[PDB]
Amino acid sequence: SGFRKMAFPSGKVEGCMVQVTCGTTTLNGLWLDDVVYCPRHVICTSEDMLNPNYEDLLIRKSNHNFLVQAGNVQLRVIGHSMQNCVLKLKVDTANPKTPKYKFVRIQPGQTFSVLACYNGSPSGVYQCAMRPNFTIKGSFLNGSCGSVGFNIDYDCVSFCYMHHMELPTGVHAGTDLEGNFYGPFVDRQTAQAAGTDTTITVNVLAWLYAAVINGDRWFLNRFTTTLNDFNLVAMKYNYEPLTQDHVDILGPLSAQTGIAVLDMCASLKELLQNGMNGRTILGSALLEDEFTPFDVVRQCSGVTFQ
Amino acid sequence: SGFRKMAFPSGKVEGCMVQVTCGTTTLNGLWLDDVVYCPRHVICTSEDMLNPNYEDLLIRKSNHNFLVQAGNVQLRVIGHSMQNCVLKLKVDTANPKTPKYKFVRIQPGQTFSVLACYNGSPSGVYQCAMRPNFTIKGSFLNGSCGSVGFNIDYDCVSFCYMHHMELPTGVHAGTDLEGNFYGPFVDRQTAQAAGTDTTITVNVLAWLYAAVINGDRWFLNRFTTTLNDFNLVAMKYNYEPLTQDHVDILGPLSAQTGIAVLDMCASLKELLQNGMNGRTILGSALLEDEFTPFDVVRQCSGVTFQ
Ligand SMILES: C[C@@H](C(=O)Nc1cncc2ccccc12)c1cccc(F)c1
Numbered sequence A, B: 001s002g003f004r005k006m007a008f009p010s011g012k013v014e015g016c017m018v019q020v021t022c023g024t025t026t027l028n029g030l031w032l033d034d035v036v037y038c039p040r041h042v043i044c045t046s047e048d049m050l051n052p053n054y055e056d057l058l059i060r061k062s063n064h065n066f067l068v069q070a071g072n073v074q075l076r077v078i079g080h081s082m083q084n085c086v087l088k089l090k091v092d093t094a095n096p097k098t099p100k101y102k103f104v105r106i107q108p109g110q111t112f113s114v115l116a117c118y119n120g121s122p123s124g125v126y127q128c129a130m131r132p133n134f135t136i137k138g139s140f141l142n143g144s145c146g147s148v149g150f151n152i153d154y155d156c157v158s159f160c161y162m163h164h165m166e167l168p169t170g171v172h173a174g175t176d177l178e179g180n181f182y183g184p185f186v187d188r189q190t191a192q193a194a195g196t197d198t199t200i201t202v203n204v205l206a207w208l209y210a211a212v213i214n215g216d217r218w219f220l221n222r223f224t225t226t227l228n229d230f231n232l233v234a235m236k237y238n239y240e241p242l243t244q245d246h247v248d249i250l251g252p253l254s255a256q257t258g259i260a261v262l263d264m265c266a267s268l269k270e271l272l273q274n275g276m277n278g279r280t281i282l283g284s285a286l287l288e289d290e291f292t293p294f295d296v297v298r299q300c301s302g303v304t305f306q
């Protein structure tokens, strides 16, 4: 038993991180087959970032202006192109350690592991969620750009996030691996507004089921509720409204615990209206929304990866 | 900026995990050079665990009773010995993926990463601390035995923990890699008492410094205090007493923030006596003690590993 914020094992991703240098700028790249993917703002100086014209900046660059280093192996660039906000550097050597992989654009509320890197080398790994306002609450310093977020399914690494920037508010923004930003953000040093950050209700419920599986049952009450009545309370506290798709996803946790989803919503409503009163749930004094229903099943059943 | 419970990258450890089978029991082993290390209770049945005589059980076993599998590679056992609570299986093939490594016995309050494994295959990675009562609050299911805890320093993997058992209270107990249990526990299915679990005060302080580095300054007050006066308050709340060694360790964080250690203790005292009053610190409604002062410097300076 027990419950932890668990990340995926990172070994398959560690072998894909390289260092990309263009002029004075050095950031991280992802080396899959014979292509390196990195943030396009590697071609900017500190002054260019206030208002970059990426097309005009990229035209003054040739293949030999990019230095790609994988530890002590120097890859030679033989082709380069800009795809949205990502640079694609075609190199002469295909990565031998290339895993089975795919590129995926996740939806808000889904979770993934981040491998934080600096100078092409791994620093640490942690789990996080894409917020409903398309930001992540990460841990990143200058030079972490190009670090990637990923999931693992069976033997396949699904890359879903590449880190680009820290907003003046301290939260983090980035793109999918096709270079499309998550959210309305642009890769330019200007004040940018993220929306209201709401709580991922379906995740909170999956975590309450995890608490029950692990012996924490005090929040369970005798009341019940309806989907419409619950959503009226949830929206007052800036919780995401619950839909029937969410009830279907929670089904397996309902079956394993014998607690109906709407009964769990009733318990949640009282926690919203009356607080936690100095008690804790799974060691936390706050309601936690960084576990999806799949995360809970995974951890509580012991799913492994090849 | 930002602050996350960050684990070490696990790639160097993933290549060392193997599956060990003896009769009907299968658990995880750690394969370094030509030796496999695993919990000695792999030689027990479900009935033997109530009162095992490990010497008598091990005598009825020969080299060919142990099946060691690394994915699809079958290692052949050519020697076996029992060292305290760990079995050492000498195999015919030295692990090619053996990293630079060492065995270390950590002290309570230090932190490490756990690679949770099942059937020799990685499942997830998370960070945790050795509690002052020598338990860990992990996330482990049946079959996770033999999963290891580790740190990384430069290029060297320091193995410090091997998982053996879940106590009837739901917390976890294990050994160093020489097979000596942390704490007073024995590898036998019997009711066992862990001591009082106290809060690691030096870790709480390092985390308050992390909060200040990250812009959370509301808990800072104008008061100050003395080491003796603080420890009198700390011991009332089951906090570990602070020593001069702890003040020396916190020095670099004091220098970077310009806040004297004793001034930080004063802030902590008021948080202990008056609570947090519904506010949060680094996203938490509880005081967090799973970050050492080194963890904080690491994350806030961007230390990488080769
Ligand atoms: C320079 C870069 C950026 O924000 N990098 C960073 C990423 N993560 C964390 C950081 C922490 C401190 C300083 C910089 C950090 C950037 C700026 C503007 C637009 C853009 F696309 C990229």
Ligand SMILES: C[C@@H](C(=O)Nc1cncc2ccccc12)c1cccc(F)c1
Pocket (backbone or CB within 6 Å): A001, B041, B049, B140, B141, B142, B143, B144, B145, B164, B165, B166, B167, B186, B187, B188, B189, B190
């Ligand atoms: C059987 C084994 C043990 O506790 N294994 C486990 C380790 N971790 C988590 C678990 C979760 C559920 C069930 C078993 C778990 C053991 C028992 C007694 C003494 C001993 F040395 C080992």
